[model samples]
Target: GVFNYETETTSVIPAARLFKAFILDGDNLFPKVAPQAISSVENIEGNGGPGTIKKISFPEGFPFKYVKDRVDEVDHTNFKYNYSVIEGGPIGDTLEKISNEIKIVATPDGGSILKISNKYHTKGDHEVKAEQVKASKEMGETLLRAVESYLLAHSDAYN
Candidate 1:
C-alpha cells in the first residue's frame, strides 16, 4: 500500500533567503540550532546536488538510529528542493521509502510560503499508522518553526 500527504507553513522570511538556510547550509546550521534533535548531517556521496546521499544521525535517546536521505533535485531557480529517504529509519520495516518535495514561493508582501508534499511508499500490505502520520506532520512544522525563528532572530545572517 502507498500513502500520500502534504503540509505547508508560511514564513515572513523571503524565499531565497530562507531556502539558502534550510537547503544549502542546513547541514552546518541545523545541528547547531536543534542539537537535541539532530546529531549531524554528513555527506556520504556526491556534492549537494542530484544523487548526493547524506546521512542524518539523531541525538542520543532519539527514536531513529539514522536516516540516509538523497538529494533528488535542487531547483534553486524555482525554489524547489526534493529529497528521498531511501535507507534506515522505517525503510526496511513496514515502509518502503518517503519522498519529500519542498517549494518555497514568495508572496507580494515580502513573505514566503513553504509547500511540502510527502509520499510514503509502504511495504507489502502494511499501511502507515495514523500515529506515525501525525508525528511526521508535526515534525515537519516543528523544524520549520525552529529555522524560522533562527532566521527571524539573525536576519543579517542568511539574507
Candidate 2:
C-alpha cells in the first residue's frame, strides 16, 4: 500500500536562507538546534548530489537509531529537494521506503513557504499507521521551527 501526504510550514526567514539550512547546511546546523532529535549527519557516499547517500543519526533513546537517505534530486535554482529513505530504523518492519519532496518558495511577506510532500510505501498488505505519519510530520515541523528560530535570532547567518 501507498500513502501520500503533504505538510506546509511558513517561516519568517527568507526562502534562500531556509533552502540553505535544509539542503546545504543541514549537516552542520541541524544538530546544533535540535540535538534532542538529530545526533548527527554525515555524507556516507557521493558528492551530495543525486544518488548520494547521507546517514542521519538520532539520539540513543529516540524511536529510530538512524536513517540512510539517498538524495534523489536537488534543484537549488528552484529551491527543491527530493530524497528517499533507503534504509533506516524509521522504516520499521512493514515499510518498503519513504520518499520526500520539499520545496521552499518566497512569500509576499518576505518569508518563505516550506512545502513537504511525503509518500509512504508500505509492505504488501500492510497499511501505514496514522501515528507513524503524525510522528514524522511533528518531528519535521519541530526541526523546521527550531531552525527558523535559530536563523531569525542570528540574521547574519545563512545569508
Candidate 3:
C-alpha cells in the first residue's frame, strides 16, 4: 500500500520576511533552531541558489534525514522555492518520495502572506504514516514560530 498526504499553513506579516527566514536566510538560524532535527546543511554547489544541493541530516528524534537538492527557486518576485531529495538520501532509502514547496506574496494590506506545503509518501504502514504527518507538522510549526518571532521583533526593519 501507499500513503499520500499534504499539510499547509499561512501567515500574514508586516512584510515579506517569511520567505527570507525560510529560504534566503536559512543559514542565519536554521541549524541552531532545529539542531535535533537538522544537524547541518552542507551546501554542495551554488551559493544557496537554485540547482544547489545540501546534505541534510538529523541529530535525534528526526523521522528521516537525507541529502536534499534544490530543484528550483525564485526571488522576491514570485517568492517560490522547491526542493527534492536526491538518490541515497534519508527517505530515498525507505519512502517513495519527500518533496516540499513554499510560496509567498505581498498583500494589499502592506503585508505578506506566506504559504508552506509539502507532500510526503511512505509504504502503507499505519503507524509510520501517522508518525510522518506528526513529525512533519511539528517541524513546520517550529519553523513558522521561529520566523514569526523574528518578524515581530524586527517589525521596524522588515516593514
Candidate 4:
C-alpha cells in the first residue's frame, strides 16, 4: 500500500536564495535552522548527486534516530530534486520507503513557491494512517518556515 501528499507554501525569499539554502546548503543549514528536529546530515557516499547516500540524524527522543536516503535526482537548472529513504528508523515498521520530491520556482511577485511532495510506501498490506502523513507534512512545513525565517533575517545570505 502507499500514500502520498503534496504541501505547498510560499517564501518571501527569491528562488535562487531559497534554492541555495535548501538544496545547495541543506545539509549544513538544516541543523542550524531546525536543530530541534535534525541533529546533523552526513554524506555517506558519493558527492551529492545520483547514487549519493545521506545519513540524517534526528535529535534524541525523536521517533527515528537516523534515516539513510539515496539521492535519486537533482536538477539545478529546473529546480527539481528527488530522494528516497531506503534504510533505518521506521523503514521496516510503518513504511518500506519514503520518496520525497521538492520543487522551487520563482513567482511573479519576486518570491518563490515551495512544493513538497512525499510518497509513503507501506509494508505489505499495511495502510498508512492520515495522522501519520499529517505529522510528516507538518514537520516539513516547520523546517521550511525555519529556513525561510533565517534567510529573511540574514537578508545577505544566498545572494
lDDT of 4: 0.87
lDDT of 4 by residue, 1-159 (tens): 768888888888888788888887889999999999899999999988998999999999988789998899988887888999899987887688999999999999999998888888887778877877777777777888899999988978888
- lDDT for 103 in candidate 3 is 76
> Per-residue lDDT tens digits of candidate 1, residues 1-159?
768888778988899998999778888877888777778988899989999999998888867878999999999799999999999887896788899899999999888999988899988887777787787777666667778889889969876
Q: List the global CA lDDT of all models.
A: 0.85, 0.87, 0.63, 0.87
- Model 3 misplacement above 4 A: 1-4, 65-67, 87-90, 93-96, 107-111, 120-128, 155-159
The 10-residue segment of model 4 with minimum total lDDT is 132-141
Backbone Cα, N, C clashes tallied per candidate: 0, 0, 1, 0
List pairs with backbone clashes in candidate 1: none
Superposition TM-score, candidate 3 onto the true structure: 0.71
lDDT of 1 at 57: 89
- Candidate 2 weakest ten by summed lDDT: 88-97
Across residues 26-73, which tens digit of lDDT does each residue of candidate 3 receive? 655567666655687677777766777776666665555455656566
* Best-matching candidate per TM-score: 2
RMSD per model, one decimal? 1.3, 1.3, 3.7, 1.5
Candidate 2's displacement at residue 149, Å, is 1.3
How well does model 3 score by local distance difference test? 0.63
TM-score, prediction 2: 0.94
Write model 2 residue lDDT over 1-159, tens digit each, in one string.
Answer: 879998888888889889998667888887999998899988899988999998999999888889898999999899999999989875867887899999999998999998999998887777777888898888888888888889888878878
